[PDB]
Design a protein around this ligand. Sequence first.
Ligand SMILES: O=C(CP(=O)(O)O)O[C@@H]1[C@@H](OP(=O)(O)O)[C@H](OC(=O)CP(=O)(O)O)[C@H](OP(=O)(O)O)[C@H](OP(=O)(O)O)[C@H]1OP(=O)(O)O
Ligand SMILES: Nc1ncnc2c1ncn2[C@@H]1O[C@H](COP(=O)(O)OP(=O)(O)O)[C@@H](O)[C@H]1O
Ligand SMILES: [Mg+2]
Ligand SMILES: [Mg+2]
Ligand SMILES: [Mg+2]
Length: 317
Amino acid sequence: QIVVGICSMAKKSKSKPMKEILERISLFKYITVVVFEEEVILNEPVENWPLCDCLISFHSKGFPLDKAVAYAKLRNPFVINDLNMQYLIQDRREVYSILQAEGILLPRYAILNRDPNNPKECNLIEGEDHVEVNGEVFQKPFVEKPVSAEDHNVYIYYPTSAGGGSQRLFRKIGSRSSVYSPESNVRKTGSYIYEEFMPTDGTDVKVYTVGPDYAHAEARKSPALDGKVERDSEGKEVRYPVILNAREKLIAWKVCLAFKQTVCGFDLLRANGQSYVCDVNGFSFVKNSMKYYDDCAKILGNIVMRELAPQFHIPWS
Ligand SMILES: O=C(CP(=O)(O)O)O[C@@H]1[C@@H](OP(=O)(O)O)[C@H](OC(=O)CP(=O)(O)O)[C@H](OP(=O)(O)O)[C@H](OP(=O)(O)O)[C@H]1OP(=O)(O)O
Ligand SMILES: Nc1ncnc2c1ncn2[C@@H]1O[C@H](COP(=O)(O)OP(=O)(O)O)[C@@H](O)[C@H]1O
Ligand SMILES: [Mg+2]
Ligand SMILES: [Mg+2]
Ligand SMILES: [Mg+2]
């Protein structure tokens, strides 16, 4: 049997999307799925972790990535989502830097790094209707993101012509994803990426790859629009159908390969006749789509089989 190891926090390992997918991967005749217990992940040295031939593992809050890396180094499994890239995925500066290098369209941006030691020694000048970040001008509206990709406190600053003030996004709480603030001045402590605001039709397109040749997309109301979450009958955020164009499929292919995340979530902004990548989140499943559960499990199982069947002497075509 080929052993597929699943190594992530229990929150993720026991989520419905995960359970739906693992159950289908298990229908592969030569595959056995082992889900590492959270207790073992956090408290046992890697030497005691289960063996696997293929490792599916990803960082979310609380996950000891260092131990996942050390485990993979010890056992040398076939790695579905590269572990070291997951340090970089946590850092918007590194994410954006990879996108530029791969020739992927993204918003014009500039990084403001504030060294925690110095009192006031940053490269930032603020006007009423713009900022200058290391000399680079951004007219409002512009977007201000914490350099930590796990920090979802993204601010949008409105131009005086639109009434000034700001929109503060956050991790969804109930009916809301953002709120208006009369505050017009940028945040004064911490490091941030500043970027041009890309005018979309008020939705974000969310893309989910499973390998570089398969990508499901769907749209959701932009959190910055007014902050009210559209919910269905069952209190799940309303999603709208999307079909990617040729440019966007190529984008999905590049993102999946550039970050070495077979399973990969990222966000597109359809603006000005193009599509811009504004966020790459790594390992991420589509929810509430039976067909995605089927495709994803099938693709992953196929990848596993293609990769490992020869050394296991299993016929596979
Ligand atoms: O928002 C919620 C609560 P709800 O899903 O409304 O019950 O869960 C988010 C999940 O949202 P959705 O796709 O709408 O279900 C969030 O997912 C999204 O927002 C969609 P995407 O993953 O960003 O494409 C996201 O889930 P995944 O990363 O597991 O997908 C969040 O996980 P986190 O980032 O906090 O670890 C997860 O929060 P939590 O359940 O508190 O951990
Ligand atoms: N450059 C931009 N122009 C216009 N809207 C943006 C831009 N960047 C982000 N947004 C909006 O803000 C939301 C959150 O920003 P994102 O980069 O996805 O951060 P997070 O990692 O918290 O999701 C996006 O879903 C999108 O609606
Ligand atoms: Mg099986
Ligand atoms: Mg996002
Ligand atoms: Mg993100």
